Design an enzyme around this catalytic site. Structure first.
Site, short mmCIF file in Angstrom:
data_model
loop_
_atom_site.label_atom_id
_atom_site.label_comp_id
_atom_site.label_asym_id
_atom_site.label_seq_id
_atom_site.Cartn_x
_atom_site.Cartn_y
_atom_site.Cartn_z
N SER A 40 -6.92 47.52 -23.64
CA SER A 40 -6.41 47.29 -22.29
C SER A 40 -5.62 45.99 -22.22
CB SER A 40 -7.58 47.30 -21.28
OG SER A 40 -7.12 47.49 -19.96
N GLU B 189 -6.56 58.46 -19.20
CA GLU B 189 -6.52 57.03 -18.90
C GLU B 189 -6.50 56.76 -17.40
OE1 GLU B 189 -6.47 54.48 -20.93
OE2 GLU B 189 -5.79 55.09 -22.93
N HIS C 184 -9.90 55.68 -19.24
CA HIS C 184 -9.66 54.37 -19.81
C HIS C 184 -11.01 53.70 -20.08
CE1 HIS C 184 -7.20 50.71 -20.43
NE2 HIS C 184 -8.05 50.05 -19.66
#
Length: 538
Positions: A189, A322, A442
């Site tokens: 990330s 995600e 995610h």
């Protein structure tokens, strides 16, 4: 114990023996300082190496994180004296120097921790690697930027913290059995964008030999922020009364408590920033003058074209859903956003040199792409999640992949895709998105690389345990061989991204196993590429 005292160039440190969730013995060193404590007049300043010590430094216990609001415990946590790193390995006396893997956590540049409650070493240390995790300053404490060359706050202190920890690993990991010529940098990330920042900045040139970029990229608009008088706006919100003088605002900020900084650093956005999709005022930024260490001297997009990292092997990837991470952020407004007639037009990146009419035509293509045979609603979100996945993460991962196929003359690039969907082990999706949602959010892949406070020992006949094995094998094989082809992918030919790359393959890791396929998102990402008709894709 005495076997676990290691002499370093800074002095001796004392580690602990540990037992993994699966009963495997390993050794840990935690809280090794790699910088001078950035306290008092050193707050917001770029980090510098720490003072040597002679007494054995106790590194047997988890240290405090950098200051941030910890969403898990719902309170501000951390200490300003937090510029420390951790080392994990089965043994610190291997027969031969081991590959080293250095992890940079995510958290939007505003939160994060190297604590083992999120990033435990248990699965990675089953392989012959040394694992390093580290703290770096986040929020305004890590990303304040002042314009005056005299003020000494050029920005990107958190990236420069990472840089100093990477230099420490290169210069000291051999004392622990690590091979400083075999360092893999990896991160998820904001940590993934951080990894890419190191591969494009001369400031970290050749500190490591290969990298894994996970679900984040310097190509993401959220990986960079403009400067719009943030120190004064921040000092104001805390309680400062003066105005119009940045250095006076910096002085007030240096006398403010760390808790007041954390409490107000996310409250500074006006209407103009919310429309542009900015994550935070306190994020990486182009630095307004050249310092002793200038991490980002110019446009990161331009830095990537001549990146020193164009000469090193890179693995890059993401998950299948995600954009699930967007749902808790917008959940109360969702009935109204899904009905807004600008829903699709507003997803065309705002910075592109496109007229309103060009944007409306692209919006109609986005609608046909994600919602060809139905209409969005709270019970019909798949297309909305897919749009979010592409807008926030996958198009800019894809732009990086294409930049690699153009600019990496000899190094290899490998692409993975993670779509494992467990009903109980996808901890981020379950605990931070929705208890009933399915798919691969995610940060779901983190549960299959690191142990955490929710993890229990898994029955070795489950798909979940097999998914840990596959992900750990691919990642550690890349760290050991610069090639992620391993026993788990034995029957397949996982090919690197070709020079003709606008179509490319990935290794798709799913509940059933692994497979080499064309990127499933290829057709979606062809539309996104078309938006850049008057702009530069890479």
């Amino acid at each position: 114990n005495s076997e676990l005292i290691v002499s370093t160039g800074y002095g001796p440190v004392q580690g602990t023996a540990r037992t993994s969730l699966y009963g495997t013995g390993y050794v840990s060193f935690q809280g090794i300082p790699y910088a001078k404590p950035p306290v008092g007049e050193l707050r917001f300043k770029d980090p510098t190496p720490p003072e040597n010590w002679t007494q054995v430094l106790d590194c047997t216990e988890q240290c405090d994180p950098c200051f941030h609001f910890d969403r898990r415990v719902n309170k501000i946590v951390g200490s300003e004296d937090s510029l420390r790193l951790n080392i994990f390995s089965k043994t610190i006396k291997p027969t031969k120097p081991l590959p080293v893997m250095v992890y940079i956590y995510g958290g939007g540049f505003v939160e994060g921790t190297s604590g083992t409650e999120l990033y435990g070493p248990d699965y990675l240390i089953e392989k012959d690697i040394v694992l390093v995790t580290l703290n770096y300053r986040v929020g305004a404490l890590g990303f304040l930027c002042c314009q005056s060359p005299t003020a000494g706050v050029p920005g990107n202190a958190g990236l420069k913290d990472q840089r100093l920890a990477l230099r420490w690993v290169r210069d000291n990991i051999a004392s622990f059995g690590g091979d400083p010529s075999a360092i893999t940098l990896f991160g998820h990330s904001a940590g993934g964008a951080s990894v890419q920042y190191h591969t494009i900045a001369d400031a970290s040139k050749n500190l490591f030999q290969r990298a894994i970029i996970m679900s984040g990229s310097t190509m993401c608009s959220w990986a960079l922020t403009p400067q719009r008088n943030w120190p004064e706006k921040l000092a104001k919100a805390i309680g400062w009364q003066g105005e119009g003088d940045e250095e006076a605002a910096l002085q007030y900020l240096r006398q403010a408590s760390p808790e007041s900084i954390v409490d107000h650093q996310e409250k500074l956005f006006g209407p103009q920033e919310i429309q542009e999709g900015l994550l935070s005022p306190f994020a990486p930024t182009i630095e307004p003058y050249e310092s002793e260490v200038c991490f980002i001297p110019r446009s990161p997009f331009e830095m990537s074209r001549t990146a020193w990292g164009n000469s090193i092997d890179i693995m890059i990837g993401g998950t299948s859903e995600e954009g699930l991470i967007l749902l808790p952020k917008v959940k109360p407004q969702l009935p109204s956003m899904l009905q807004d007639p600008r829903l699709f037009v507003g997803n065309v990146p705002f910075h592109l040199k496109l007229s309103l009419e060009q944007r409306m035509a692209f919006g109609e293509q986005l609608k046909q792409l994600y919602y060809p045979d139905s209409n969005p609603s709270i019970d019909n979100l798949d297309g909305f999640v897919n749009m979010a996945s592409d807008r926030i993460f996958w198009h800019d991962l894809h732009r990086t992949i294409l930049a690699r196929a153009n600019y990496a003359c000899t190094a290899k690039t490998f692409v993975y895709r993670f779509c494992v969907d467990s009903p109980f082990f996808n901890h981020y999706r379950i605990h931070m998105v929705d208890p009933n949602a399915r798919g691969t959010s995610h940060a779901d892949e983190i549960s299959y690389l690191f142990s955490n406070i929710f993890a229990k020992p898994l029955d070795k006949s489950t798909l979940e345990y097999r998914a840990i094995q596959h992900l750990v094998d691919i990642f550690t094989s890349f760290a050991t061989n610069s090639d992620p082809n391993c026993d788990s992918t034995a029957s397949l030919s996982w090919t690197a991204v070709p020079k003709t790359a606008p179509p490319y393959n990935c290794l798709n890791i799913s509940n059933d196993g692994v497979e080499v396929v064309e990127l499933p998102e290829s057709r979606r990402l062809q539309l996104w590429d078309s938006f850049y008709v008057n702009d530069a894709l890479f």
